[PDB]
Amino acid sequence: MALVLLSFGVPRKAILYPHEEPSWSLAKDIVFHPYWMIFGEVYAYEIDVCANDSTLPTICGPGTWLTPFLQAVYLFVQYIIMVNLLIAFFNN
Amino acid sequence: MALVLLSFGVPRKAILYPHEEPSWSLAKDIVFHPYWMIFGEVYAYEIDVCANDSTLPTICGPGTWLTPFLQAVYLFVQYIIMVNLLIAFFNN
Ligand SMILES: CCCCCCCC/C=C/CCCCCCCC(=O)O[C@@H](COC(=O)CCCCCCCCCCCCCCC)COP(=O)([O-])OCC[N+](C)(C)C
Ligand SMILES: CCCCCCCC/C=C/CCCCCCCC(=O)O[C@@H](COC(=O)CCCCCCCCCCCCCCC)COP(=O)([O-])OCC[N+](C)(C)C
Numbered sequence: 059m060a061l062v063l064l065s066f067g068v069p070r071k072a073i074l075y076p077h078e079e080p081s082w083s084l085a086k087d088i089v090f091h092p093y094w095m096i097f098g099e100v101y102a103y104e105i106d107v108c109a110n111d112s113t114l115p116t117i118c119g120p121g122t123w124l125t126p127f128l129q130a131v132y133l134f135v136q137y138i139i140m141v142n143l144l145i146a147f148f149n150n
Numbered sequence: 151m152a153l154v155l156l157s158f159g160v161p162r163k164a165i166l167y168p169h170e171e172p173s174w175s176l177a178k179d180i181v182f183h184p185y186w187m188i189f190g191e192v193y194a195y196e197i198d199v200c201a202n203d204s205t206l207p208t209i210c211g212p213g214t215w216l217t218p219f220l221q222a223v224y225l226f227v228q229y230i231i232m233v234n235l236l237i238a239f240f241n242n
């Protein structure tokens with residue numbers, strides 16, 4: 059579950075923030091939002107940053123249409139497979 | 151689950167509100183948000199009160215960078231261990 063997290067946070071932070079110099083904030087932002095997604099926080103109005111209801115309208119740019127596809131795969135893996143595999147683990 | 155709650159709400163309220171005189175509001179605020187976290191309310195824009203998207207920008211101060219680490223441990227214990235232990239309880 060920690061690897062699926064980094065498989066998602068690093069492409070997302072890279073596609074949505076292309077103009078970043080090296081910073082310790084890059085170690086938070088690859089791990090912060092993808093972790094809070096495991097607990098039901100979808101960040102609904104940050105998905106599709108080019109939408110009109112977006113709360114990140116300045117992040118709209120080339121390639122950012124990829125991130126909602128990425129997060130759809132991410133939560134399917136984490137919530138629909140990995141959290142329920144862990145329920146199944148505990149039950150058995 | 152009520153003890154993991156107080157293990158989190160008391161360090162959080164202490165780190166984020168250092169300048170408090172004794173008040174009955176201290177018995178609510180150690181128990182209120184940590185309980186609503188069990189039911190999927192992450193308080194996403196109150197985590198990391200020093201962030202730019204924060205809805206508590208005045209709470210930013212010394213030591214407040216500890217609280218997102220604390221809440222990451224908190225929900226892991228409550229949701230990933232304790233809620234699913236309780237599912238496992240009921241199934242068996
Ligand atoms: C057995 C358990 C052991 C733990 C194992 C796991 C290891 C956990 C390791 C995680 C790596 C975190 C590294 C922090 C990066 C530097 C932070 C920094 O510079 O300042 C930040 C620190 O202040 C905060 O408030 C944020 C602290 C991070 C919260 C982590 C919660 C998510 C849990 C994740 C769990 C999933 C882990 C998935 C696998 C990796 C603040 O903001 P900034 O912008 O970064 O800098 C300041 C600038 N500013 C003032 C403009 C805002
Ligand atoms: C079930 C329902 C689906 C029905 C079926 C038919 C599919 C329909 C698809 C049709 C493809 C055409 C869509 C784009 C329209 C034209 C260009 C355009 O407006 O681009 C937009 C984005 O979109 C893109 O840039 C491209 C998006 C392509 C993703 C398509 C997924 C393929 C199907 C499924 C893949 C799943 C996996 C497949 C394996 C099974 C531009 O808008 P923006 O992003 O807001 O940015 C603009 C602002 N900017 C200029 C600042 C950047």
Ligand SMILES: CCCCCCCC/C=C/CCCCCCCC(=O)O[C@@H](COC(=O)CCCCCCCCCCCCCCC)COP(=O)([O-])OCC[N+](C)(C)C
Nearest residue numbers: 151152153155156174175176177178179181182183185186
């Ligand atoms: C079998 C079941 C039995 C129950 C067992 C559990 C014990 C339950 C007991 C919990 C302790 C409650 C102590 C209340 C403190 C005093 C509050 C007060 O005076 O006013 C508040 C009451 O109005 C509210 O809105 C808060 C009421 C608390 C709701 C509980 C929610 C969390 C669930 C709890 C469950 C988790 C417990 C985890 C374990 C501890 C309002 O605001 P204030 O600021 O406080 O005062 C007014 C000032 N102001 C106008 C400026 C706002």
Ligand SMILES: CCCCCCCC/C=C/CCCCCCCC(=O)O[C@@H](COC(=O)CCCCCCCCCCCCCCC)COP(=O)([O-])OCC[N+](C)(C)C
Nearest residue numbers: 082084085086088089199200201210211212213214215219
């Ligand atoms: C997977 C990804 C991680 C990659 C690995 C490398 C780790 C990277 C970390 C590197 C450490 C350096 C980060 C801070 C940068 C310099 C100072 C700074 O800006 O501080 C910031 C906060 O942060 C702190 O004050 C310190 C944060 C330290 C905790 C880092 C986690 C340790 C590893 C994991 C721990 C898990 C458990 C470990 C056991 C397994 C200040 O910013 P702010 O908070 O916004 O407040 C500023 C405003 N104010 C002045 C009003 C207050």
Ligand SMILES: CCCCCCCC/C=C\CCCCCCCC(=O)O[C@@H](COC(=O)CCCCCCCCCCCCCCC)COP(=O)([O-])OCC[N+](C)(C)C
Nearest residue numbers: 069073076108117118119120121122123124125127128131
């Ligand atoms: C699932 C199976 C495959 C099916 C998918 C079929 C292919 C999908 C369909 C179409 C392909 C992508 C093109 C459509 C959208 C283009 C419109 C556009 O400009 O968009 C953006 C740029 O976007 C780009 O420049 C995209 C470049 C290619 C991305 C890499 C391929 C991704 C496929 C992933 C496949 C993963 C498969 C994983 C395998 C398991 C917006 O650009 P702009 O801002 O408007 O430009 C002006 C910028 N300026 C102002 C700064 C100058």
Ligand SMILES: CCCCCCCC/C=C\CCCCCCCC(=O)O[C@@H](COC(=O)CCCCCCCCCCCCCCC)COP(=O)([O-])OCC[N+](C)(C)C
Nearest residue numbers: 082165168200209210211212213214215216217219220223
């Ligand atoms: C997990 C395993 C161990 C690894 C831990 C890694 C250690 C982490 C690394 C380094 C230590 C922490 C400090 C680094 C950041 C300092 C930057 C800073 O100033 O931050 C803040 C202050 O914060 C402080 O002053 C905090 C001082 C130490 C806190 C106690 C240790 C926390 C580690 C717990 C470990 C738990 C272990 C649990 C064991 C299971 C912000 O200050 P400021 O607002 O900028 O100052 C101006 C304020 N003024 C304007 C009011 C004057």
Ligand SMILES: C[C@@H]1CC[C@@]2(OC1)O[C@H]1C[C@H]3[C@@H]4CC=C5C[C@@H](OCCC(CO)CO)CC[C@]5(C)[C@H]4CC[C@]3(C)[C@H]1[C@@H]2C
Nearest residue numbers: 061064065067068079080081082083084085086087088089
């Ligand atoms: C197998 C796993 C693959 C993924 C991963 O774990 C192992 O690989 C690690 C390598 C890390 C980076 C190393 C170097 C730096 C440079 C630093 O530069 C300070 C500049 C300035 C501050 O302003 C100093 O004053 C900022 C942090 C950064 C980019 C790291 C980020 C986290 C990364 C990507 C980690 C990530 C979780």
Ligand SMILES: C[C@@H]1CC[C@@]2(OC1)O[C@H]1C[C@H]3[C@@H]4CC=C5C[C@@H](OCCC(CO)CO)CC[C@]5(C)[C@H]4CC[C@]3(C)[C@H]1[C@@H]2C
Nearest residue numbers: 153156157159160171172173174175176177178179180181
């Ligand atoms: C084993 C467990 C450890 C944790 C815990 O349970 C047992 O320990 C309890 C002790 C409680 C405090 C006792 C005294 C007061 C003073 C009062 O002062 C009124 C001032 C003014 C109003 O403005 C009057 O006019 C405010 C409340 C406060 C701080 C209590 C808060 C809750 C606490 C921390 C409880 C907490 C849940």
Ligand SMILES: [Ca+2]
Nearest residue numbers: 097098189190
């Ligand atoms: Ca939820």
